[PDB]
Subunit: 218 residues, 4 copies
């Protein structure tokens, strides 16, 4: 079926120091909306929680419909053949993050196991000093180099407390076990408008919301 609920185990390290969080959420697969509540399973995060935002669930594209039918993500959930996500994120100050997102399915419930590793963040930079204030709205571009692969790109920017934006070049592959349907492959590029919100009163517990909208035309 289409998803109704999900859980996430997100873990890895930033600048060599481990982190680990767990949480659960819901979403509406007719509209590309999702919500997630997460908490650290040890102490508060030693880095800005905003650095995790694109890995939170964009993190569950099974909630994303396409304009005229199911997204390839949804189709791959429906027969449980699935897909894997691999990403590399290059920040303006030389730091980089790499991630691998993996899923299992139980009816309308998704379980995510997401490994996120970041290195090279300056100790005085906005990530390690908690100066990110929001993730800018984004447009993500998808092309399909072959019938089992989506290449997704965007320029990711955050606002910060001193007014400057903090930039990143984001690249991702989604690799499918079975070919995507012809009606998906025939419409390229596909764009996705992404909006997010994050609330956290401490660096230990987070509430995340997202809305995504696919479009190939205007």
């Amino acid at each position: 079926p289409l998803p109704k609920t999900h859980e996430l185990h997100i873990f890895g390290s930033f600048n060599g120091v481990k982190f680990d969080m767990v949480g659960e959420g819901t979403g509406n697969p007719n509209e590309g909306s999702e919500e997630l509540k997460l908490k650290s399973t040890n102490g508060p995060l030693k880095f800005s929680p905003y650095i995790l935002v694109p890995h939170l669930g964009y993190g569950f594209n099974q909630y994303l419909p396409f304009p005229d039918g199911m997204s390839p993500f949804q189709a791959a959930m429906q027969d449980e053949s699935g897909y894997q996500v691999h990403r590399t994120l290059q920040y303006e100050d030389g730091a980089f993050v790499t991630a691998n997102l993996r899923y299992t399915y139980e009816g309308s419930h998704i379980k995510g196991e997401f490994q996120v590793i970041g290195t090279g963040f300056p100790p005085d930079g906005p990530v390690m000093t908690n100066k990110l204030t929001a993730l800018d709205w984004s447009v993500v571009k998808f092309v399909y180099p072959n019938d089992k692969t989506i290449l997704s790109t965007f320029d990711k920017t955050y606002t910060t407390t001193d007014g400057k934006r903090y930039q990143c070049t984001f690249r991702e592959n989604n690799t499918f076990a079975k070919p995507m349907a012809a009606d998906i492959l025939q419409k390229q590029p596909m764009f996705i408008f992404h909006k997010t919100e994050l609330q956290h009163s401490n660096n230990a517990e987070l509430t995340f919301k997202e809305k995504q909208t696919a479009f190939s035309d205007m």
Copy 2:
């Protein structure tokens, strides 16, 4: 005033070999549409005319309105203070193009002088062997690092005769003589949906059309 007509002198070199074209066009600054007819001032181009498409006029953003009023490009034409365009384009096969676009104004008529230099295109690649078939529709992202500068980015792809897409990472600065208005600076990022068409029966004469639409939300 807003523009009605334009002319272009576009020149430079590809792989060390000079080219030079001139032409004239029109556009509708209420809708972000433009048309241009161009011809080589010597022989046919020795490279795919499609490689010139983003430099043709996106090349005249004075025809681009913003969602709630004039674009910064239009405002800068209205008092003739103007702006300059500088771009760097990195292709997947190692080649790169750099360009500088400059304008003068005479009432509702724009004159463009555009220098485009490309190097490192493989002699057997799709540019030098005329295998590009169309420029994919694009979404361009704008942010404003300061009141006189737009940083524009996108992933640019062409379709080719053998089915594969030909990729490029595009970066641009627009540098304004006078600050952009507060109402521009307050809405970031700004996105632009771009559609183009190119007709050419030989590599010597081209007809180009474009439609651009700014949006900050969906």
Copy 3:
């Protein structure tokens, strides 16, 4: 002590398909030389073994001396405080590899656990159609953004059977538990000349050799 011997478990996936190898090697920490024999723990690798070469042991920089004394890698082994390696590799045809290298120490013996994930390799590209013939000799650049971090960069190229090179932009962080010594930090950049050899007659059983030489001057 300085290392004499090592073992490696290298695993991950390419284009969504798991691989796993184990092996053992030796090296000379006076000269930056190492040798490794590896065997797949299932069947032959489904991709060119040359794509792993950079992750085999550069993979054990505990064998690398510096010009005037121990490298930071060697010093970090001597007190077992250690370091972690994180890398991101962007190939010319859009594919990318990410990796995490981790070590444990038992006297003069090193154990490596290396996770390498690659995606987006075209099925007809040089990696998936065994076109890579050798890794070019390289010069790696090190700078130290802070006392616990090395940022390593190079342009990585392979020769291929198509008579062209296959290119990659390589970025790496080495993150140390304890600060590097002042004599290390005082000499930047540091360069490393790397030579490798890969012998194999099948894709399940590899023999790798390397020689590295550090230099800050000529």
Copy 4:
């Protein structure tokens, strides 16, 4: 013949503001050394002169010998067939520089006409606030994608008064009118160790020195 002397006209703009300098120099084509004295033809430069260092004469590789004979640059001067240089430089803070270097020859005298355009330098960044203190020694990598083209790459860093480095990804093509000799093409990659010095007490009058050494092995 091999060069003994040179002159340079270097011009363009930074952040939309024109600059122009002229000067003269000498070098030793047996050793890859050069010296240049430059003066602004208006007032002092409005940006750090260190940002030009890479374009001063690496700027005259006709002074660079190769390990076993003339460099391709020297050979191309000997018959005056020549070469053109095109570069794109991406700085860490989003700014970029593009350049085109052109030469004419009169016996052992070279005349350079170099156009350098930079945009997007933050007004409070290291370039516009004179924080650059030296260009790090570099190793430049050359490969030859075809017999008329050198692709040159390096990671370029400056030290700064903030006690950090200011980074750039440098890419260049050298495009030759006639094919390079077989003895050049047969040895790849070729590396070049570069050292520079800049003396100035004001921003209108610069003294530049460089030493380059080619090597394919260690």
